[PDB]
Design an enzyme around this catalytic site. Structure first.
Site, PDB file in Angstrom:
ATOM      1  N   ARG A 277      22.133  46.121 -25.934  1.00 43.42           N
ATOM      2  CA  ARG A 277      21.102  47.042 -26.414  1.00 43.42           C
ATOM      3  C   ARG A 277      19.848  47.008 -25.524  1.00 43.42           C
ATOM      4  O   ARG A 277      19.098  47.971 -25.480  1.00 43.42           O
ATOM      5  CB  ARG A 277      20.694  46.692 -27.858  1.00 43.42           C
ATOM      6  N   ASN A 278      19.654  45.902 -24.810  1.00 45.92           N
ATOM      7  CA  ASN A 278      18.470  45.655 -24.008  1.00 45.92           C
ATOM      8  C   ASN A 278      18.744  45.646 -22.519  1.00 45.92           C
ATOM      9  O   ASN A 278      18.024  45.021 -21.741  1.00 45.92           O
ATOM     10  CB  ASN A 278      17.845  44.318 -24.428  1.00 45.92           C
TER      11      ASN A 278
ATOM     12  N   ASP B 245      13.087  44.563 -20.521  1.00 42.64           N
ATOM     13  CA  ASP B 245      11.796  43.860 -20.445  1.00 42.64           C
ATOM     14  C   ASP B 245      11.659  42.959 -21.639  1.00 42.64           C
ATOM     15  O   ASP B 245      11.815  41.750 -21.533  1.00 42.64           O
ATOM     16  CB  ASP B 245      10.597  44.865 -20.391  1.00 42.64           C
TER      17      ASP B 245
HETATM   18  C1  LIG Z   1      20.619  54.913 -25.078  1.00 42.00           C
HETATM   19  N1  LIG Z   1      19.574  55.670 -25.803  1.00 42.00           N
HETATM   20  S1  LIG Z   1      18.885  57.095 -25.284  1.00 42.00           S
HETATM   21  O1  LIG Z   1      17.914  57.467 -26.282  1.00 42.00           O
HETATM   22  O2  LIG Z   1      19.954  57.918 -24.844  1.00 42.00           O
HETATM   23  C2  LIG Z   1      17.992  56.513 -23.820  1.00 42.00           C
HETATM   24  C3  LIG Z   1      17.349  55.264 -23.887  1.00 42.00           C
HETATM   25  C4  LIG Z   1      16.656  54.776 -22.798  1.00 42.00           C
HETATM   26  C5  LIG Z   1      16.589  55.534 -21.611  1.00 42.00           C
HETATM   27  N2  LIG Z   1      15.938  55.068 -20.478  1.00 42.00           N
HETATM   28  C6  LIG Z   1      15.082  54.002 -20.348  1.00 42.00           C
HETATM   29  N3  LIG Z   1      14.687  53.710 -19.127  1.00 42.00           N
HETATM   30  C7  LIG Z   1      13.849  52.704 -18.849  1.00 42.00           C
HETATM   31  C8  LIG Z   1      13.415  51.947 -19.910  1.00 42.00           C
HETATM   32  C9  LIG Z   1      12.487  50.783 -19.669  1.00 42.00           C
HETATM   33  F1  LIG Z   1      11.275  51.009 -20.331  1.00 42.00           F
HETATM   34  F2  LIG Z   1      12.333  50.625 -18.307  1.00 42.00           F
HETATM   35  F3  LIG Z   1      13.051  49.593 -20.059  1.00 42.00           F
HETATM   36  C10 LIG Z   1      13.858  52.253 -21.206  1.00 42.00           C
HETATM   37  N4  LIG Z   1      13.454  51.497 -22.296  1.00 42.00           N
HETATM   38  C11 LIG Z   1      13.984  51.837 -23.608  1.00 42.00           C
HETATM   39  C12 LIG Z   1      13.114  52.947 -24.244  1.00 42.00           C
HETATM   40  C13 LIG Z   1      12.468  52.298 -25.483  1.00 42.00           C
HETATM   41  C14 LIG Z   1      13.320  51.054 -25.834  1.00 42.00           C
HETATM   42  C15 LIG Z   1      13.990  50.578 -24.540  1.00 42.00           C
HETATM   43  N5  LIG Z   1      15.369  50.152 -24.866  1.00 42.00           N
HETATM   44  C16 LIG Z   1      16.054  49.713 -23.645  1.00 42.00           C
HETATM   45  C17 LIG Z   1      15.386  48.959 -25.734  1.00 42.00           C
HETATM   46  N6  LIG Z   1      14.660  53.296 -21.397  1.00 42.00           N
HETATM   47  C18 LIG Z   1      17.242  56.779 -21.515  1.00 42.00           C
HETATM   48  C19 LIG Z   1      17.923  57.255 -22.633  1.00 42.00           C
END
Ligand SMILES: CNS(=O)(=O)c1ccc(Nc2ncc(C(F)(F)F)c(N[C@@H]3CCC[C@H]3N(C)C)n2)cc1
Length: 263
Positions: free
Chosen positions: A138-139, A152
């Site tokens: 998930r992370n 992060d």
């Molecule tokens: C898989 N879910 S989604 O909504 O399709 C999606 C979900 C993330 C993303 N890209 C994406 N790119 C970069 C980052 C980060 F900030 F660099 F880590 C990121 N962080 C997420 C956004 C808030 C929570 C954190 N997750 C990893 C815990 N997210 C692109 C699409």
């Protein structure tokens, strides 16, 4: 030169999802050389405590200093007004969902490769005795079909089903606890994103562990790789491999799985 980033350089386009401290947005950062970079822009809730506003920044500054091909990239920081942390945007989203979606196409080669990549990010963190408390699918973000990046956050409500006995019992978290957690993450990867111990309740985990019982081998997990996982789940933290050793082993498994698939 105009080093760093100005709020002008960054436009917000849509919601991405809620982060620990606040909403994260998708947007576009315009370069010192005019290039448009897609970014995830993290924010901190305006109503949160000073201790939370300080942790938000504390985490950011660490991420700014980290430089690894398999750890999420921090591009810049806007401290003023509403504080913005500008991260690289990984278009494919979270590994657990990506695995669930692509479970019928992914080859074991690639699953071992993602494991190896995360293991290298962890060997780097180990070299500074930085502990990551959230090595879980998930992370981890998917930068491309062949590249993953450890998240992060995690650099109450604990991930009990991912934690070593010492973590659960004494809230002890060391490099060796990260080795345990990292093998759980390998198990999620090779299971295409199942939750570890999905068949138990959180209260039942420790007792099972104390019994010598462990996550069973995923169907497509190579026996050699399972033996590796098993060593990472030694009850005794001194007996667990270090991350430098795991990189070596996983490199070997990866090279083998590659040969097997190319011929
Ligand atoms: C898989 N879910 S989604 O909504 O399709 C999606 C979900 C993330 C993303 N890209 C994406 N790119 C970069 C980052 C980060 F900030 F660099 F880590 C990121 N962080 C997420 C956004 C808030 C929570 C954190 N997750 C990893 C815990 N997210 C692109 C699409």
């Amino acid at each position: 030169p105009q080093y760093g980033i100005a709020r002008e350089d960054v436009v917000l386009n849509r919601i991405l999802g809620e982060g620990f401290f606040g909403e994260v947005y998708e947007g576009v950062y315009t370069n010192h050389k005019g290039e448009k970079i897609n970014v995830a822009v993290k924010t901190c809730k305006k109503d949160c405590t000073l201790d939370n506003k300080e942790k938000f920044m504390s985490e950011a500054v660490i991420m700014k200093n980290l430089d690894h091909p398999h750890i999420v990239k921090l591009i810049g920081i806007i401290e003023e007004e509403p504080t913005w942390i500008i991260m690289e945007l990984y278009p494919y989203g979270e590994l657990g969902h990506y695995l669930e979606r692509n479970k019928n196409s992914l080859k074991v080669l690639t699953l071992v490769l993602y494991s190896l990549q995360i293991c290298k990010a962890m060997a780097y963190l180990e070299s500074i005795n930085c502990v990551h408390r959230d090595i879980a699918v998930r992370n981890i973000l998917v930068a491309s079909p062949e590249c993953v990046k450890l998240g992060d956050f995690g650099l109450t409500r604990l991930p009990i089903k991912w934690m070593s006995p010492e973590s659960i019992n004494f809230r002890r978290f060391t490099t060796a606890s990260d080795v345990w957690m990292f093998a759980v993450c390998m198990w999620e990867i090779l299971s295409f994103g199942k939750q570890p111990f999905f068949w138990l309740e959180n209260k039942d985990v420790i007792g099972v562990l104390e019994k010598g019982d462990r996550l069973p081998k995923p169907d497509l997990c190579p026996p050699v790789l399972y033996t590796l996982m098993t060593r990472c789940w030694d009850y005794d933290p001194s007996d667990r491999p270090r991350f430098t050793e795991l990189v070596c082993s996983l490199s070997d498994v990866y090279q083998m799985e590659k040969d097997i698939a190319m011929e």
